[PDB]
Amino acid sequence: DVVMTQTPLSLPVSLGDQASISCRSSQSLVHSNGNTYLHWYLQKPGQSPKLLIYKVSNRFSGVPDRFSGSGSGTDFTLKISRVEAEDLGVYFCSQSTHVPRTFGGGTKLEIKRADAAPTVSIFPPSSEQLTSGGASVVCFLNNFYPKDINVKWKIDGKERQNGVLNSWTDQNSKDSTYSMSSTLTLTKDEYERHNSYTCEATHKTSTSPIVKSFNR
Amino acid sequence: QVQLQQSGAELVKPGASVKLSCKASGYTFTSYWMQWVKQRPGQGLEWIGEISYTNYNQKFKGKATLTVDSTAYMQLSSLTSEDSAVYYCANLRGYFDYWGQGTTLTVSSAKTTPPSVYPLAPTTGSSVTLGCLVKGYFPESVTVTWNSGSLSSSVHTFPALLQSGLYTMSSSVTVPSSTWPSQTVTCSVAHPASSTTVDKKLEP
Ligand SMILES: [Zn+2]
Structure with missing residues (x-):
């Protein structure tokens, strides 16, 4: 004691x-x-x-x-x-x-440290994952500061809330910024039914959300 | 110098006993007490005992059983999910402070399952961000490297989340645009529990 x-x-x-x-x-x-x-x-x-x-x-x-x-x-x-x-x-x-x-x-x-806006990147599902029946679409929001950030998935302009996983990173020892991964996972079929997959981030360094999309 | 060689990870089914070792080297074992500390993911640090004249913490009274001698072992007994933490061995004598790497002990009935590694390639920019998606593994403890580990400057490894009873994680790397796809980057994922090592080349 x-x-x-x-x-x-x-x-x-x-x-x-x-x-x-x-x-x-x-x-x-x-x-x-x-x-x-x-x-x-x-x-x-x-x-x-x-x-x-x-x-x-x-x-x-x-x-x-x-x-x-x-x-x-x-x-x-x-x-x-x-x-x-x-x-x-x-x-x-x-x-x-x-x-x-x-x-x-x-x-x-x-x-x-000084405010930093994230750099978003979105990646569609790989052929390899697709041939296995599932489809994870991943989005990285790298090197931002402060840690407060909100991510939104939109499938054909329609907001998706279920099935998304978000992981943060501890403050980077190199430049004190943070990072995060948001992953929307769906079946091959749900995935093949839609066209636009959008990753939207609301961060204080911007009044307007940083968006990133890819059309299938 | 003092080196405290410890196992890396251990998976055991609840109810069994496990015996973790700690190979002491670099010093005369016989001159310093061997301590043991437990740390659960949520930061907290707890002392367990020292040693073959053992001195224990009363909370870990019937859980640990210290032995020794080149090595010092700690045997935990009747494991529960609570018993899953990092266990270290250490010489905490004032200016003489040395800690082992730690041994992560996952207690679970779950079955080891190897990771599936998918490449994530995107386009335009002054640099390009690529990554790998490691999913479906159990237990945790997977290491992702880039170019056998020679690319470290811009690598963000994201913590493993538990999706549907199996872990998932991604790692990202940003290289300059003119070097990809001119040069291939490949991510290496090693899951030691299943003795798996898979590389994935990043092509467009
Ligand atoms: Zn649609």
Whole structure:
């Protein structure tokens, strides 16, 4: 036990700015031997966590001075001096003063960057998929910012809402933009019955929706 | 340097027991405690135990059973759907912190099923976006590369969604217009559960 709580849960910050992540404990973290075993890790997507700071303010080999830990007893703080795109991920705090060692929930740090409109692309079903009886028509909305975007499928001007799957991408570590795939799947027959397949995206960077279609 | 060699994935039917290993190398095993942590997709991180004088977390009292010795194993017991998470082994001693790659343990009665890979070709522009559609696979864990992985600069891999009991996912890549179809790009999809590896050439 001993619950570690972090605040904030999501922390947006523009490049070059400072970022502060707070972790507080449900009990004092000062061991009877005088050490405070509070630690901070950074978990990047599809990777195990890596240590940044241990025992409140000591850096692990390699970790740059942008990162600094402070705190005492129950309140601890991770500060980042100049956020860089390479810094995005989920920061966790941990304590090993008390058994069982316990972790916090996470503070997903996300970069604030200039607005970007998505670049839509639509692809009709392949011959290969078609010969198997099904037909997925896919649409990619790549490299946009902010993550808020709405996609609409229209089959011959008629809106399609069932059978569509949408997947997002975490903020891209290279340019802080987001991406998304919308996939309308139908049978060969439903597909062969219609003509125009449209992918419409409403994103704030445009008053008028970005549309993309192909006629069969 | 310290290397903690762990299995990549494991699929087991609910109710069975599974024993995950962690091959320690690069250091004298005998000097540091071997820890274990569980992480469920939804971020959360939980400690399970250390070790052959084992010290456990009380919640995982009757689920784990640590053994050792070159290796340290963790045996989980009476698996449920809740038991599907990433399990790591680690040396968490202060300035000495090393984590294994993790072993994804999918607990399911489902049957492994290989992916169907369809190419997605479009036209005009200063660059062209192509992609592949990987559908029908189980369990997750599929890797999609472009040109044996030599094309990485503009690759967006989209998370796997669960459509009708089987996973689906797409990957996209954007190359300059003058290079396609002048040069072919091909996407490689590897589903290890079924020992599948299929390439798909991107033709107009
Ligand atoms: Zn129609």
